[PDB]
Design a protein around this nucleic acid. Structure first.
Ligand SMILES: [Mg+2]
Ligand SMILES: [Mg+2]
Ligand SMILES: [Mg+2]
Ligand SMILES: [Mg+2]
Ligand SMILES: [Mg+2]
Ligand SMILES: [Mg+2]
Ligand SMILES: [Mg+2]
Ligand SMILES: [Mg+2]
Ligand SMILES: [Mg+2]
Ligand SMILES: [Mg+2]
Ligand SMILES: [Mg+2]
Ligand SMILES: [Mg+2]
Ligand SMILES: [Mg+2]
Ligand SMILES: [Mg+2]
Ligand SMILES: [Mg+2]
Ligand SMILES: [Mg+2]
Ligand SMILES: [Mg+2]
Ligand SMILES: [Mg+2]
Ligand SMILES: [Mg+2]
Ligand SMILES: [Mg+2]
Ligand SMILES: [Mg+2]
Ligand SMILES: [Mg+2]
Ligand SMILES: [Mg+2]
Ligand SMILES: [Mg+2]
Ligand SMILES: [Mg+2]
Ligand SMILES: [Mg+2]
Ligand SMILES: [Mg+2]
Ligand SMILES: [Mg+2]
Ligand SMILES: [Mg+2]
Ligand SMILES: [Zn+2]
Lengths: 97, 43, 85, 72, 60
RNA sequence: UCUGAUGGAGGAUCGAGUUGAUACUGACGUGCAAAUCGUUCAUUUCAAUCACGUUUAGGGGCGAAAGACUAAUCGAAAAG
RNA sequence: GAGAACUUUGAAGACUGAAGUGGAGAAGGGUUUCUUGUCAACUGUGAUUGAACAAGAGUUAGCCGCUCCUAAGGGAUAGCU
RNA sequence: AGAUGGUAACAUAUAUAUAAAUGAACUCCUUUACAUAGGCUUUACACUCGGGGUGCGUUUUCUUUGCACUUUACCUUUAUAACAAACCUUGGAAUCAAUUUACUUGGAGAAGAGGUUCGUUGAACUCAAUUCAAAAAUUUGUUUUGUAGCAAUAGUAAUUCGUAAUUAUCCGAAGUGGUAAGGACUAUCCUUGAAAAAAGGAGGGAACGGCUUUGUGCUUUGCUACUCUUAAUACUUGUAUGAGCGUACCAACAACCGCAUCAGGUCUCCAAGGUUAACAGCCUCUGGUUAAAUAGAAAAAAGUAGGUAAGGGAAGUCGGCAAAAUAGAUCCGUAACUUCGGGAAAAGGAUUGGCUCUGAGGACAUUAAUGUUAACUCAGAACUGAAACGGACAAGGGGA
């Protein structure tokens, strides 16, 4: 099952660097309680403007959002950015107001 | 209370009407005023 | 285990009330609360509902009787006399 | 409120002169579901056709003196 | 005297007065709103906000 | 004749609330108050408690009786 | 606003803690409700506040009650006193 | 001139709407219509838990995270399903059986097998429909729909775009038993726990189609669409649908009674999380306030509501008044005396935290093994700490 992040708007303002984000995602993603897994159960790839998560295990879109938020907090982009649902499989960064 | 007899309601209305002060123009040609909290109608 | 030795049914009253009175109550209580033999169905199911009323759970027939026992001896005697007559 | 299942019964009801208004509703189902409501003087009869084309046909069939309400 | 306005906001939204945020900037604009429709408009604008519920976390 | 359960009886027990008012003879005593406040205490399935309605009226009523109470009035109300 | 410890708004910090100064009602109250004013006195301090004062305005039912029935009871009819 | 089914319990009119199942006098019932206590069950709301979906919150560090929303009304005798009863048919029960938490019941017919009804409940159940394929004169198999209609068009949480509109969400599992209601019961009484209006049922069998003609409502003669029943309509007759009254607000915190905006008094319903036996007390969320006939500054005496005091322990005092001590629970242990019921929580002891484990107690559903999985309560063992633990709150002093 595919889950998406349309990272365009802040990626095209340089402030968002997809490569770092991908790494962060890799680090974070717990699998039955351990971060270092990400085996045959989850895959993460990236376009220039889009992050892709594909899951075989019970996985929550909420989790992705949370991760994104965490990332934002880390890189100080909290008052500028927002995670928003577009389509059911599709999350997207949007500018705060 | 919030469920009055018609007669009682009418009486209340009358009392209210009585309450209002002299129309000022007359003064150019009251002691019986009442306050709902200090003097009861004893109805 | 059997709880009371001499008290029996009057265990609800406890310590209060003269012991003699309680003893008397006990007999009367026993009389009241025993399922009497119904002289219609045969099943020992006639129980006291009111003061002088005795209803059976089987027939639903209300039989007039004594206050505590279903039949007072005097009444029985009277009945017997009538029968003889 | 009343639900209807006999198409024929529904038709009969429609044919009846106390039926001033009709309603037709479209619902995205969890395809396009369609409710046919007839509003009689005493009851509002409703038929749920799961199949769009059939629903459309039935609507077409409905007397053109009915005062049809397209809700959505 | 924003009393009335606050009251109106309370009813319209379904929240208690304790929960309406009237922005201290544009207190003149708000006081002018003597009606429920106007209150609604204000809310839409973002000159009146439903305060966030005080948190009661089950976690512990 | 005992033993373990079950059972859920009782004007039983403790006890919030409620109804009261034991003590401090506490505070207050030109008070918050013409009887209040605080702490303590008694009461809580019954002779229970409360509401509304209703009955009984003054040498009368009502009283689990204190001459109690009968509109802050009682060993005979109040009003004229 | 002339003037603000006790008007209003925001931000804190707090209490009431579902036997609540929360919702609804009954008795009793009777316009206390609401808006616009507004401060002589009153609001035992102040007060621009107000259950104050002034002008208006507000209570919409075949279904919620009363309206009907009977209860403890009451007022009477016939009498009789 | 007045239906039918069903062995029976009893059922049947599903017309837009179950409208219609002759019935008079005169009767007989029933509903209305009923105490308290105890538990048990079922539903409902409430609360909670796990997941998915939305938005917000935290992010030095940690957290698949914390919070919020995920809604569904009367009405349709709602259709059904499920269950406590009651009844019917079959069946014939000692080697007594069925059975509840409890006892209750059974040759006056039990168990079992099949039914009927009322009552809860109100979409449970494949409920309905649809997709077609096979079997008789309609039934079985599969699929797609529907928050069963109401119903999504309404809410709620979002997201936008515009100066009101679109869009996406609205749902898969379960536990706690706090309320409330119902049910079947059981117990208590020298207490046996309203009445009527109104409605219903039954017995009973009075009366009996229409039209035309003739004679004095009655009788005779001839003919066959008639008696019902809803809804609609048209027409006359007074104008042939809904009379009047109450509805603000307060309900005490300043709207009531206490001479007042007086710490008093004044009836009822709703009732969240935590800790807990608890609707106790303590703290929190929703809602509500941050006000109370005053503020500020100092911080003497004295007062008042409190605290705490070495050693002693009632020597104080009319008198242990006041205060302190005691207390929750589990385990032990329990005298005199007694009306044998109690005394009794007698007296008097011991234990209690946190952490990490272990054992004990179910439900289903596969085929005795294997699974999915649910509370909370017990009991025991380590370790741990300034020897502490009903750590606050709450909570008997006891005896002769
Ligand atoms: Mg009144
Ligand atoms: Mg007064
Ligand atoms: Mg005294
Ligand atoms: Mg004193
Ligand atoms: Mg003094
Ligand atoms: Mg004397
Ligand atoms: Mg003041
Ligand atoms: Mg607090
Ligand atoms: Mg407190
Ligand atoms: Mg209030
Ligand atoms: Mg006002
Ligand atoms: Mg003043
Ligand atoms: Mg004003
Ligand atoms: Mg006035
Ligand atoms: Mg009514
Ligand atoms: Mg009459
Ligand atoms: Mg009478
Ligand atoms: Mg008389
Ligand atoms: Mg919608
Ligand atoms: Mg009102
Ligand atoms: Mg109002
Ligand atoms: Mg007061
Ligand atoms: Mg007075
Ligand atoms: Mg005051
Ligand atoms: Mg000392
Ligand atoms: Mg000593
Ligand atoms: Mg001495
Ligand atoms: Mg001395
Ligand atoms: Mg003492
Ligand atoms: Zn019998």
């Amino acid at each position: 099952i595919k889950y998406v992040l349309d990272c365009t708007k802040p990626v095209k303002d340089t402030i968002l660097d997809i490569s770092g984000l991908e790494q962060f995602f890799k680090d974070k993603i717990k699998v039955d309680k351990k971060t270092n897994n990400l085996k045959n159960k989850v895959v993460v790839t990236s376009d220039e403007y889009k992050i892709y998560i594909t899951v075989h295990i019970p996985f929550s879109k909420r989790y992705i959002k949370y991760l994104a938020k965490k990332y934002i907090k880390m890189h100080q982009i909290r008052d500028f950015l927002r995670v928003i649902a577009k389509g059911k499989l599709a999350y997207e960064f949007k500018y705060f107001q | 209370g919030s469920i009055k007899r018609f007669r009682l309601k009418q009486r209340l209305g009358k009392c209210r009407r009585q309450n209002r002060p002299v129309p000022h123009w007359y003064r150019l040609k009251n002691t019986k005023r009442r306050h709902w909290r200090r003097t009861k109608l004893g109805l | 285990s059997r709880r009371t030795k001499k008290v029996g049914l009057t265990g609800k009253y406890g310590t209060r009330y003269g012991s003699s009175l309680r003893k008397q109550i006990k007999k009367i209580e026993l009389m009241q609360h025993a399922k009497y033999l119904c002289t219609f169905c045969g099943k020992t199911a006639t129980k006291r509902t009111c003061v002088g009323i005795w209803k059976c759970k089987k027939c639903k027939r209300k039989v007039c009787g004594g206050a505590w026992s279903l039949t007072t001896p005097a009444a029985v005697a009277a009945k017997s006399t009538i029968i003889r007559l | 409120p009343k639900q209807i299942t006999d198409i024929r019964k529904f038709l009969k009801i429609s044919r009846k002169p106390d039926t001033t208004a009709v309603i037709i509703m479209k619902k995205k189902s969890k395809t396009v579901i369609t409710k046919l409501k007839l509003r009689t003087k005493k009851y509002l009869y409703t038929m749920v056709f799961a199949d769009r084309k059939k629903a459309e046909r039935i609507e077409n069939s409905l007397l053109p003196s009915l005062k049809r309400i397209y809700y959505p | 005297s924003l009393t009335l306005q606050k009251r109106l906001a309370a009813s319209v939204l379904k929240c208690g007065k304790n929960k309406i945020w009237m922005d201290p900037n544009e207190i003149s604009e708000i006081s002018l709103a003597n009606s429920r429709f106007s209150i609604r408009k204000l809310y839409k604008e973002g000159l009146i906000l439903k305060k966030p519920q005080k948190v009661h976390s089950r976690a512990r």
